Amino acid sequence: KKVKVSHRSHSTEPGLVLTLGQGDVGQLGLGENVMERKKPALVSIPEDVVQAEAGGMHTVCLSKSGQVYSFGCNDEGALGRDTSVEGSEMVPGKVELQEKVVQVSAGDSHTAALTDDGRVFLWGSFRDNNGVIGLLEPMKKSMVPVQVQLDVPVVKVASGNDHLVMLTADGDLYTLGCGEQGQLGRVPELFANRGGRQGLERLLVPKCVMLKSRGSRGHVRFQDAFCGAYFTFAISHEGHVYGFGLSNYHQLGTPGTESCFIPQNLTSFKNSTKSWVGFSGGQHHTVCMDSEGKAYSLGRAEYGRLGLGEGAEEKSIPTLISRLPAVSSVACGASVGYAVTKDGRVFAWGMGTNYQLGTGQDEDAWSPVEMMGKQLENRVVLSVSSGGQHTVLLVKDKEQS
Amino acid sequence: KKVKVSHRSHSTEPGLVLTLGQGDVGQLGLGENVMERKKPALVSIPEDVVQAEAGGMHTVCLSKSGQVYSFGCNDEGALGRDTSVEGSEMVPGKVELQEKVVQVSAGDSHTAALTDDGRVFLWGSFRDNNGVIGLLEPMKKSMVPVQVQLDVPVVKVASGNDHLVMLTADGDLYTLGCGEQGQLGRVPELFANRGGRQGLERLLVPKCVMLKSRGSRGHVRFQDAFCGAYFTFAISHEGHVYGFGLSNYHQLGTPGTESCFIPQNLTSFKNSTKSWVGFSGGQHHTVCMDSEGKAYSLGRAEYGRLGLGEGAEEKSIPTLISRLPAVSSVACGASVGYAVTKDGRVFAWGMGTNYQLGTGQDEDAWSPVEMMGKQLENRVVLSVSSGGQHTVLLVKDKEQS
Amino acid sequence: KKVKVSHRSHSTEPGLVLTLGQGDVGQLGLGENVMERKKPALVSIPEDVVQAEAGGMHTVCLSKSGQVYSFGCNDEGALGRDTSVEGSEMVPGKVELQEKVVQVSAGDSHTAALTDDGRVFLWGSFRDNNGVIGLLEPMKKSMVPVQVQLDVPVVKVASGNDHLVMLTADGDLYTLGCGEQGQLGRVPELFANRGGRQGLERLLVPKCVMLKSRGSRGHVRFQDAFCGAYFTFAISHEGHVYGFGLSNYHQLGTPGTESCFIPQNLTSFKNSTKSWVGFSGGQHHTVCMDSEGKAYSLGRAEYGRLGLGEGAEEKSIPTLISRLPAVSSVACGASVGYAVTKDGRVFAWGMGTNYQLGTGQDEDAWSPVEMMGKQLENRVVLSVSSGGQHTVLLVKDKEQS
């Protein structure tokens, strides 16, 4: 019995959760009285947290013991717990599952959790430009965690705004949700609106990305995968970076701007000397990082989201963000970008309006700015995640024997 | 006076030694009364240890001060010390070697040690299918550490079951011992049975692997070398991976199952994004790792030794082991595989009989299982090594820097 | 708003400064009575130091608080502070500059400093073979810091004996100073027969190295740049190594020995398994390092400066220095080479005359020798930097308690 799974993407260092930005629907998790925070504030949870993800208008936290906590908007079921008591969504609450959870992901109105034996649970809903499309069945959200139907243990989950990707232990990439911009990587453009002529149920059941064998026999398998808001990056076993999804501002790293429905081997990412280890993306920009402590951006320049300095222009190839210290992880919010450094600091850039930058001000930042303030004093940042209008940090007291 | 050598493969972090598995002949180093340990147990060594290696049925520990300690079967002289005292082979004792040693290696019935000035000592014996062949001289084992007659400084030593490889400062690879499966990489089959008519001096006198450099240069030189039970891997200064020795289950990463007597350039390892840093191998399988925290396995699948999940089948190309956290080092025992993670944990997989897996059970593990236990709590694993029926860990109290 | 910039090269870890070698003109910083130190000696600085650099015959230390301390020969203004008082140049003194400096660099007669917002300050003067040429204007040294502001923030500064290179946030390399050996990589035209002094103003103004990009875009841009005494190495965004400057002993890694006035794409550095991350060089040799902890040398072999062992001969391709632990950084002095290990040790090799090797003796070392002594006991080395006849170390107390 009990055959567990692990993965290099799983997080295990215990920490405290801090939130900042907008909190009108409970996404800050600071109760009914705090609707906005200009600087990071502590979210008290009765356990240490190893992972903290920001969805569109909600926040999902994973404790060290495998307990999921959630807060924010539950109108579509994204919290995965009953919030009938007025205000219960404004503070952390438990998502009840029997098994220990080892990784979570969050999109615009959905949340996913991977158990320690590789089963995937999903709740909330997905939506398309026009409206809700359902979750696992056409047109139906789920308020409760529901098991995704698969026959093989999954080692990683990742979410875009309205799609879920699942990497199996054997390297198959299964995708489900909205496929309108080609972010599922397994649906023709013909079936972009609502599964076209072959129903929604095809989009919402987990099905595998099927390519080639960039040799002569097999179908390509993957060693990792990541999502941006409406796009996906998948790294093959050979080390090639495949992109599918929206690229209307060249955010996928393509020369043209049409959406990519069939996964493309991105030649803008081919092994210079950079082993690509982390990808993230908001609606129209991408921030990624290599194995040598460097972060790069591509996509739309407006409001400083590329972090390349004032007067930066649209990029269609990964462009080095030189102004950062050595980098350990990167993340994007809808119009903001972040890097966590190897020495435990966090830098932010992009659209300032929602107070996601942590400068204390609502001005945009075209160059990376180190986030400071009381709650980051004498602490090391472990991660940063960002949604539509808020940002969630995971921190640890900066050790002192 | 003597010039000292060093190498990136040398270990220098002090810790404690723990052992588990079978201990009939003293290989656990826990006394005459402890014949088996299902979970790791502390071994009383009078000094901190920087390297701990498991031979077939013995264990060799290198202290921070350069002293070698040994415990286990001394029938063949593998302990390199006098075990007249009853039960003295079952607890650590000082190897009789007046040198500051900086690296050790162990085989089925032999042990090697590298001095700080690049001289190699060897003790015990080598055997072929047929029986004991001697050590440095034909038909003579050595109960005491004896100096290898080489006249160039050696920077790294590695052992298979019955062979020794020595990488010089200039990148030559000298090999000696049993060459019956091509593991010396310099002996024709036609003379691999104890050298045939030419007798054992054709196997036991240190001689160097000679490959006529491609692009007609001199001869190929190497930056690293590792051993499996009956095979050797060597990385050229160009970084090409070469393999020689037993590949009856494709453990060398070759298409056929024929022992390789001539070094092969292993095209299966050629990759733009994977830099090969570590190799290990039991009888019939190989576990290796790249520079990006990923471990791969190849060879025989029986009993779960590949760590690729249930129903895994024989592999002939390095195959990602996805169910592991980021990996820092790998090792194999006869029929078992291990990976130490960057965060200080250790996972095991393969044949369970001997209790080497540290699960507490004797069932095989077809996927990696995390080793737990009271001795591992609040400690980080620095290294893991495995022999026929036991496993040896080097650990430290929850690391401070 | 004066937006701050950083870079992965900027040093942040507080330490103590040690010096050794010759101190005739104050470069040891130990006062008027200490003219020579055979082993590392502690130099009292009022604050913790994050970066310690050796100029030709001076030393520049950057405090954690952003202040600069200097000591050594101030005949040309390299110290950037008033040493009218007899002996005041023999001990650390503060440079009066109301800026938070985040990086420094030092040459034969000049020092440069980079502010937290990306502006460069330079002082002293540059010389060519025929004498002093000026600093930013012909024939004019500066005893105080002079601002050099480009249209874009500078993220890294690096110095050779008599040239300064600045890498902008946008990946442009701006060079100035002496160009007699091609180390500016930009006015080949001015050195074709002609003396650099005929277009001297053009050389003392910071101007961009302009390389057309083949199957071209505009021009090539760089992710990093380093200097040797009379040459410069720049790594493009694609990871190609470019070099320009002196190569009379093949130290640039060129087949020929003529000085290279245009950036050369060094095919000797092209290799699928090596990613180059660090470069250093004395007059006639180079010591560089890859992303996998390996250090390499090339150039003149006389006096052991390649660290490849006795009888080494001239090298024109990066040649592995096998006899080192895993490397974290490399440095050169005029005729010596160093490597700091990942475990905090420092190794030296090359010409021993000036007592730069830290052996306690003045003999050459043709292979790497670990630097020991009282001041390195129980301490971890953070950096090493070396000039004409002295060497500067930055160390920290072993991280226990």
Curated annotation (Swiss-Prot), chains A, B, C:
<dbReference type="GO" id="GO:0051225">
    <property type="term" value="P:spindle assembly"/>
</dbReference>
<protein>
    <recommendedName>
        <fullName>Regulator of chromosome condensation</fullName>
    </recommendedName>
</protein>
<keyword id="KW-0677">Repeat</keyword>
<comment type="function">
    <text>Guanine-nucleotide releasing factor that promotes the exchange of Ran-bound GDP by GTP, and thereby plays an important role in RAN-mediated functions in nuclear import and mitosis. Contributes to the generation of high levels of chromosome-associated, GTP-bound RAN, which is important for mitotic spindle assembly and normal progress through mitosis. Via its role in maintaining high levels of GTP-bound RAN in the nucleus, contributes to the release of cargo proteins from importins after nuclear import. Involved in the regulation of onset of chromosome condensation in the S phase.</text>
</comment>
<dbReference type="GO" id="GO:0007052">
    <property type="term" value="P:mitotic spindle organization"/>
</dbReference>
<feature type="repeat" description="RCC1 7">
    <location>
        <begin position="343"/>
        <end position="396"/>
    </location>
</feature>
<dbReference type="GO" id="GO:0007059">
    <property type="term" value="P:chromosome segregation"/>
</dbReference>
<keyword id="KW-0498">Mitosis</keyword>
<feature type="repeat" description="RCC1 3">
    <location>
        <begin position="118"/>
        <end position="169"/>
    </location>
</feature>
<dbReference type="GO" id="GO:0046982">
    <property type="term" value="F:protein heterodimerization activity"/>
</dbReference>
<dbReference type="Pfam" id="PF25390">
    <property type="entry name" value="WD40_RLD"/>
</dbReference>
<dbReference type="GO" id="GO:0005085">
    <property type="term" value="F:guanyl-nucleotide exchange factor activity"/>
</dbReference>
<feature type="compositionally biased region" description="Basic residues">
    <location>
        <begin position="1"/>
        <end position="9"/>
    </location>
</feature>
<comment type="subunit">
    <text>Interacts with RAN. Interacts with KPNA3. Interacts (via N-terminus and RCC1 repeats) with KPNA4. Interacts with ARRB2; the interaction is detected in the nucleus upon OR1D2 stimulation.</text>
</comment>
<keyword id="KW-0158">Chromosome</keyword>
<keyword id="KW-0132">Cell division</keyword>
<dbReference type="GO" id="GO:0016032">
    <property type="term" value="P:viral process"/>
</dbReference>
<feature type="repeat" description="RCC1 6">
    <location>
        <begin position="292"/>
        <end position="342"/>
    </location>
</feature>
<dbReference type="GO" id="GO:0031491">
    <property type="term" value="F:nucleosome binding"/>
</dbReference>
<feature type="repeat" description="RCC1 5">
    <location>
        <begin position="238"/>
        <end position="291"/>
    </location>
</feature>
<dbReference type="GO" id="GO:0005737">
    <property type="term" value="C:cytoplasm"/>
</dbReference>
<dbReference type="GO" id="GO:0000785">
    <property type="term" value="C:chromatin"/>
</dbReference>
<keyword id="KW-0539">Nucleus</keyword>
<dbReference type="InterPro" id="IPR051553">
    <property type="entry name" value="Ran_GTPase-activating"/>
</dbReference>
<keyword id="KW-0488">Methylation</keyword>
<dbReference type="GO" id="GO:1901673">
    <property type="term" value="P:regulation of mitotic spindle assembly"/>
</dbReference>
<keyword id="KW-0597">Phosphoprotein</keyword>
<feature type="repeat" description="RCC1 4">
    <location>
        <begin position="171"/>
        <end position="237"/>
    </location>
</feature>
<dbReference type="GO" id="GO:0007346">
    <property type="term" value="P:regulation of mitotic cell cycle"/>
</dbReference>
<dbReference type="GO" id="GO:0000794">
    <property type="term" value="C:condensed nuclear chromosome"/>
</dbReference>
<dbReference type="GO" id="GO:0005634">
    <property type="term" value="C:nucleus"/>
</dbReference>
<dbReference type="GO" id="GO:0003682">
    <property type="term" value="F:chromatin binding"/>
</dbReference>
<dbReference type="GO" id="GO:0000082">
    <property type="term" value="P:G1/S transition of mitotic cell cycle"/>
</dbReference>
<feature type="repeat" description="RCC1 2">
    <location>
        <begin position="65"/>
        <end position="116"/>
    </location>
</feature>
<dbReference type="GO" id="GO:0032991">
    <property type="term" value="C:protein-containing complex"/>
</dbReference>
<dbReference type="GO" id="GO:0031267">
    <property type="term" value="F:small GTPase binding"/>
</dbReference>
<keyword id="KW-0963">Cytoplasm</keyword>
<dbReference type="GO" id="GO:0042393">
    <property type="term" value="F:histone binding"/>
</dbReference>
<keyword id="KW-0131">Cell cycle</keyword>
<keyword id="KW-0344">Guanine-nucleotide releasing factor</keyword>
<dbReference type="GO" id="GO:0007088">
    <property type="term" value="P:regulation of mitotic nuclear division"/>
</dbReference>
<dbReference type="InterPro" id="IPR009091">
    <property type="entry name" value="RCC1/BLIP-II"/>
</dbReference>
